[PDB]
Amino acid sequence: FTLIELMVVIGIIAILSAIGIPAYQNYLRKAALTDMLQTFVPYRTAVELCALEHGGLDTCDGGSNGIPSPTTTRYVSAMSVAKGVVSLTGQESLNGLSVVMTPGWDNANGVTGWARNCNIQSDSALQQACEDVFRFDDAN
Amino acid sequence: FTLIELMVVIGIIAILSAIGIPAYQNYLRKAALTDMLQTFVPYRTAVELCALEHGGLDTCDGGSNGIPSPTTTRYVSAMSVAKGVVSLTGQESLNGLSVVMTPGWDNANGVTGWARNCNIQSDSALQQACEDVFRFDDAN
Amino acid sequence: FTLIELMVVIGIIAILSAIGIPAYQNYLRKAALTDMLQTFVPYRTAVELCALEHGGLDTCDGGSNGIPSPTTTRYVSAMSVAKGVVSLTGQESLNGLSVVMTPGWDNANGVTGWARNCNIQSDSALQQACEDVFRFDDAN
Amino acid sequence: FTLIELMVVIGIIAILSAIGIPAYQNYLRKAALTDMLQTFVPYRTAVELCALEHGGLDTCDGGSNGIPSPTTTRYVSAMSVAKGVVSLTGQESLNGLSVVMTPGWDNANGVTGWARNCNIQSDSALQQACEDVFRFDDAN
Amino acid sequence: FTLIELMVVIGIIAILSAIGIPAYQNYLRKAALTDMLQTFVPYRTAVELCALEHGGLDTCDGGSNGIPSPTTTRYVSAMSVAKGVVSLTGQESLNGLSVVMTPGWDNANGVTGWARNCNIQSDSALQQACEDVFRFDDAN
Amino acid sequence: FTLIELMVVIGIIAILSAIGIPAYQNYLRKAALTDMLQTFVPYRTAVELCALEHGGLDTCDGGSNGIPSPTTTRYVSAMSVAKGVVSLTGQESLNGLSVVMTPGWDNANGVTGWARNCNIQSDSALQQACEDVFRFDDAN
Amino acid sequence: FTLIELMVVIGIIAILSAIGIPAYQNYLRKAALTDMLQTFVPYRTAVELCALEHGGLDTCDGGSNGIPSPTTTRYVSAMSVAKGVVSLTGQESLNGLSVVMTPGWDNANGVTGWARNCNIQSDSALQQACEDVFRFDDAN
Amino acid sequence: FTLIELMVVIGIIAILSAIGIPAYQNYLRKAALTDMLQTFVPYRTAVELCALEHGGLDTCDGGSNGIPSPTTTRYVSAMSVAKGVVSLTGQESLNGLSVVMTPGWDNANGVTGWARNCNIQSDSALQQACEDVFRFDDAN
Amino acid sequence: FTLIELMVVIGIIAILSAIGIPAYQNYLRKAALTDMLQTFVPYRTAVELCALEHGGLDTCDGGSNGIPSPTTTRYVSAMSVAKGVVSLTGQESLNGLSVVMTPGWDNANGVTGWARNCNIQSDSALQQACEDVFRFDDAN
Amino acid sequence: FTLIELMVVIGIIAILSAIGIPAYQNYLRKAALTDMLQTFVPYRTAVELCALEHGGLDTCDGGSNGIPSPTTTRYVSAMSVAKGVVSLTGQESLNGLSVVMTPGWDNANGVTGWARNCNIQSDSALQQACEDVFRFDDAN
Amino acid sequence: FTLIELMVVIGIIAILSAIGIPAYQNYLRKAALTDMLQTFVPYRTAVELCALEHGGLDTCDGGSNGIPSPTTTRYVSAMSVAKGVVSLTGQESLNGLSVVMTPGWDNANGVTGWARNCNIQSDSALQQACEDVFRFDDAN
Amino acid sequence: FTLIELMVVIGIIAILSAIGIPAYQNYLRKAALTDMLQTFVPYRTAVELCALEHGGLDTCDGGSNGIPSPTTTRYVSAMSVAKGVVSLTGQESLNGLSVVMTPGWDNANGVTGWARNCNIQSDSALQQACEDVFRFDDAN
Amino acid sequence: FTLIELMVVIGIIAILSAIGIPAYQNYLRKAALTDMLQTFVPYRTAVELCALEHGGLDTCDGGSNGIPSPTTTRYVSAMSVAKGVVSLTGQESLNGLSVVMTPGWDNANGVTGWARNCNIQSDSALQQACEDVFRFDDAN
Amino acid sequence: FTLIELMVVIGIIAILSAIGIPAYQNYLRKAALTDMLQTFVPYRTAVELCALEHGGLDTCDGGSNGIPSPTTTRYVSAMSVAKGVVSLTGQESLNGLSVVMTPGWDNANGVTGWARNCNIQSDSALQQACEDVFRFDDAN
Numbered sequence A, B, C, D, E, F, G, H, I, J, K, L, M, N: 001f002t003l004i005e006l007m008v009v010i011g012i013i014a015i016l017s018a019i020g021i022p023a024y025q026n027y028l029r030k031a032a033l034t035d036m037l038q039t040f041v042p043y044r045t046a047v048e049l050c051a052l053e054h055g056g057l058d059t060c061d062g063g064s065n066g067i068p069s070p071t072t073t074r075y076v077s078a079m080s081v082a083k084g085v086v087s088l089t090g091q092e093s094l095n096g097l098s099v100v101m102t103p104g105w106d107n108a109n110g111v112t113g114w115a116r117n118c119n120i121q122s123d124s125a126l127q128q129a130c131e132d133v134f135r136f137d138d139a140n
Helices: A003-010 A021-054 A124-132 B003-010 B021-054 B124-132 C003-010 C021-054 C124-132 D003-010 D021-054 D124-132 E003-010 E021-054 E124-132 F003-010 F021-054 F124-132 G003-010 G021-054 G124-132 H003-010 H021-054 H124-132 I003-010 I021-054 I124-132 J003-010 J021-054 J124-132 K003-010 K021-054 K124-132 L003-010 L021-054 L124-132 M003-010 M021-054 M124-132 N003-010 N021-054 N124-132
Strands: none
Touching (some): A021 G003, B021 E003, B021 G021, C003 D021, C003 F021, C021 D021, C021 E003, D003 F021, D003 K021, D003 L021, D021 D124, D021 I003, D021 K021, E021 E124, F003 L021, H021 H124, K003 N021, K021 N021, L021 L124
């Protein structure tokens, strides 16, 4: 009867329980996307000031008229912004990301909301994370 | 339970609260119209002097017999005046504006009030602003 | 609350206070009529000299026997006189005026007072001014 | 901690700041009363002409002896005048108004000032506006 | 409305009422002529004494046989007399005057009345005054 | 002793920890209600303009006099507005919702605040969310 | 939405309404001219007395034969008069003014009216005020 | 702009137009002098009767030989006469007046005209009125 | 700050400047009295002719021996005359007036001046006008 | 970020904009002074009548010889007049006011203009208003 | 190794994360204070009308001369107002609150700003909220 | 030698190795306590909502205002909750258990943490398990 | 799997969301600038009175001729004014600020608008706030 | 063959399986660090209030201006805070710990993030836990 505990090692000890690791990066990394949306927020306000008086988008470019210069959540490899765009090239492990957040602005039209553009080229599941954060849809 | 705050970012953080920006230009720009009515006022007085003695409208043309030369609130692209008319071509972002403020004058008749004429060709909502400032109606 | 001052411009600033201009011309122009009665006065005296010795009206015609030649208050377009008549054709803005001031003279009769005749054909309110100056009534 | 911003919407977002709207109509409408006093003014002058020579009030009735016919500030529903009275029935939203501005005239007496009479039957606060414009008191 | 009183100064205050001054000198100066006829009167009497006995005109010359010496109403610049003549050179402002009052005398003929002669060379209206005083006609 | 870890799977591994999911929809969905109150806000302003001059509610109906046309937070199945009402039929998963936000307006009265009306017919807990957002009470 | 009231301060609060101040001095100062014509009036009468008997203009000089000495409306810097002239050097803020009111007198001619002469050297708009008061034209 | 009418009250309403009052008394009072010359006239006739037969001046004293007793124009404070003298002490407001109208009479000499003597001690301008009425010169 | 102009209407616009109208009738009506004295004048002359030869007053009654029949300045309601009396019943607005101008005549006495009698029964201020025209005193 | 709107209430909502209220009373109250000058005007005319014939100031006292009795603009607490003086004790909120408008009259002197005397004892800024209305200076 | 997850429940699961609840009431309740300042605002305007004409504070008491009656943000237990005071007894959970907002008014002084008075007796931290809203300082 | 294996059965085969069974129930049952703390957790959240707005504990009672009704891990014999209390009577084999989790709430105080109360009456070793799970200490 | 929540603390809990604080001071401080423009406003009016009569700028200096003495919004460290200048040295945290608001005045020129001068030496972004409030441009 | 089971006890029974205990303390203790970061969080908020208005760090010190007093997760031996610092001396078994969390604040600079400082002096592996929780890096 003593042999059975060795057999449970042959199988039962190998429960192989594990968090699905690729799913795990999907979640915290998605948080990096969402935290990036938080990085987008101050830009939403300063761009509203560009809407407020400057009369056009070049004033809306980051790094000017008091707009904050774009900058990384530390895990991210890179970022850039102009006209309020957040083409986050170099995002996290997220190669090829670029939320081409084209501004919706033209004041006589009344247009305003930024045009989101998912662009996570490195993997489609990551795109499931963008639709779940920076929706590819253009209303903001 | 920790996932819910990420979900509030999926929706609640996007309150998307905003002043309706096109409505916003309608209000300050309407103020540019009304400030223009203030620009019209000194002309109403000098034109009354034209009524006072000159005996006819050419004397009422701006830039003469002491009448002030017409000039822009600084946002406005352009203006012109003659016979007391304030055809504000080039108004603000208000393309096509021209308050054809034809004078009502002929002294034997006793006629006096200027003939307002809304002419904001660029958008009808802007016309709601003219009716709300320079009424299209002719009594003044 | 800030919107209300713009609303007072929508209405209260347009007090549209004004002197009734046609009434205004009625008053100063009536003064031109009355000043014309003053122009009539020297003629009343020289015509009395015609009564004084000449024995008839042709001597009473203006421009003769020392009578002054008829002449305009400067605003007036025209005038004429004969037998002491002051048919002020061309008066002021007063088209059609003619105070047919026919002399009342014939000395054996004892008649003397000039026959006033309102004749402001251009407007009836102007006639209210003549009754208020050169009364249509004939005693003088 | 994220829940608090939703709570500020439960209360703080409902600042419910507002101009007291009924007070607002009290002010611009009071301006309609005061503008009406301006409408009364030309009548004060023509009635002075009635005092000037006609010798009695029927001549003072509006629409005659050159007096202007009574007429509305455009918001007003109605008006009427006789003997210089300004019983503004139909005023603005001001139902029941009638400033029974009875003339004070009788020249041998030396009496002149018009007898004001507040009569804003539709609401007492409106009467506060009449005392603040057309005082119920009779001196003018 | 306040501007109108300034306008009445623009016109009504300039009533420009005035006595016609040249006519005024015509009247008092004519009185100087007539007063001169009064100066002529004592001479008419003393000349009648010359008719009375002396038998001819040299006795009629002024300043002799008790005749008064000729002399000025004080305004007059000069005078002279001989044979009863009153050639009033230097009269008043009346330059060139000379009533060549030639005597009509020759007693066998029965002739008597002085020959008046208007001679107011300075202006014809003054001559209207002489015909109205010292008639150019010769009967006296 | 080896058997115990299998027993912990019989019970302890089934911690069955979970966010209470129906409570979870209550929270984000409540946010959809509150975001809807944000959708109500621009309408509160344009309706104030209807209060501003139009003089009555038909002008207050959405889609007119510059009022925005009603429209969905994207999760919502449907919406409608008239006289400023926000009867959000089709809200979210919120079947039967209709905030019958009847306007409180009549300016002579001074009345203004919108009449809220909870109407989440699909479940009473959802009504706890309406009282917690669009209170059934009528002050706004 | 709170930012808009700050924006109305950026523009609407700067209505910059103002009476045109240079026009304002034109009006009250013109009144100083007209009041000066009133100062001229007593001189018109005493000069008529100079016409009345003295026989020439030196008697017409101010400060003599009972004529009032010339003197300032208090705002005026200076004045002078001779032969009835009103060369108002130093008028008000009106540098260079001098109404060279040369008398029209010579009694044998019948001439009388004073020769007005606008001379407001400091600015041409002021000359518009002289033509509107002391007309440059010579009849009075 | 409303402030300007208050400013016209600050200056323009104070036209301070006025008849020069001291000049006014000069004119009517001068008329009292001239009316006094009319009072002198009947005395000129009765004194001529004194010349007519009495042979000397005591008979010429007023109040005798049918001469009228001296008496006041009612405004005058006092009067007296003797030998035809009209020393009008107490004249009008004319303190110190006394026209010492000494008679020129002595019949063998042929002398006749009364010796006028201006004596208006109260003011020299009044003396301008005496030279203009009772000339200080002695011919009458 | 905008409210102040409305306040100036509450008070400053009501300057209530006016000629004192009852004083105004006092002046022109007094002129009607004085013009009536002018009407009295021809009667003074014809009555002097009655003094001239007729030997008594019935001849002095108006309407006879060439005396003019009495008649109204047109504003006057009525008049009558006898023995030179001017009891102007019905004068102007001057009810009760009657200048009982009784003649002073009786030639052996030397009496002549008419006996004035103020009798303006309608108001005492009017009597101030009679003392200022037809003095109640009897000398003329 | 939500906290900032509460902070703007901590400061920006307290714009504390206000008309400077004490300055406001200075302006309308100054108008009460100026309206008082208008009350002074009829008195200027009746006092001119006192100058016209009465010969001295007691006749100039108000309430007599037809002068109007003194009376309040309704806001004023009190007034009095004698010899044409307008010592407006009790003026408005203007405690201690008294324009001791002593008449300048004595006709032999030719003096006429009333002696103004600012006397607003309650505050010096009010005195700035008197110098700006009833100047302390004595010419009128 | 399996025991460790139970140990994390012994400690790590008890993160005890929480919003500091008493701080939470401090914030929304402070908003109730600030919303109360908004309730104070309409009263600031009507009290300015009390400043506008009534002349004293009793007219400034709430519930009169058109002032709104005081009333609760619904969470508040009670309120009262007089002379513009906002002694908010019963505020929220804020026992003992009373912003004794004594008016600063006395118009001759020019004083205006309301005297704030923090009075949150229930806790000092609440007083930190009053200094952060209704500052204890008196300028408004 | 063969007898020895029988002897090892006399002793060695009776190794009597065993998990200490009472210790075993201590561990899994302790897990039932800890799982119960997990059952407590949703209640911690809903009670926080009771803290969120209801203002007191009755709203905090389970089974109300959306709070979950209390319920058993299946091994447990019974449970109950009120005011957030988790007096788990009938726990597991744990007779007498009752974690009298009295809420720490009173918001003005800022108090919040639940008052734990070990109450495993059936055995003290079980109490070692409560101190190791639901600590008797009151902070939560 | 339990380790992941600790990892979210390693990153996700550090959302580091924050209002950009330096931007925050830019906004409320800009409000201090704009509130300062409100402080400038009463000075704009009193300086207009300096334009009104004083004739030059020294009268325009603050603290005189009734102008308010300059004073701080309480956060400001310092201020000064002369000739209407608002060189706000010591503004807020705004070191080096000085809006050298030189007056545009010289009345014969018609010049009026104040010369703004941004001078926020402490930081250029603050200058963006001045251009957004007190524009460096000189028209006002 | 029976001997082998005794031999498995000689080796196989000594599996010596064990969680690496020092690693175990590293994990739960790291949780004590992370829970400490949670303790840091309320301080992050109150310090943001210090940023909010106080203007400097002393107000940011814990235990003041409403900041919570610092306090231990119960395992910790000690803690302290000032200027927002969390120098956790006495942490857990973590001797020498002190996260010198120096605040990053100076508002004109815009600086904000707290300066983390790992300081786990007792062991370097513990420092691996600080880098994994309170990173030595200074951004927060």
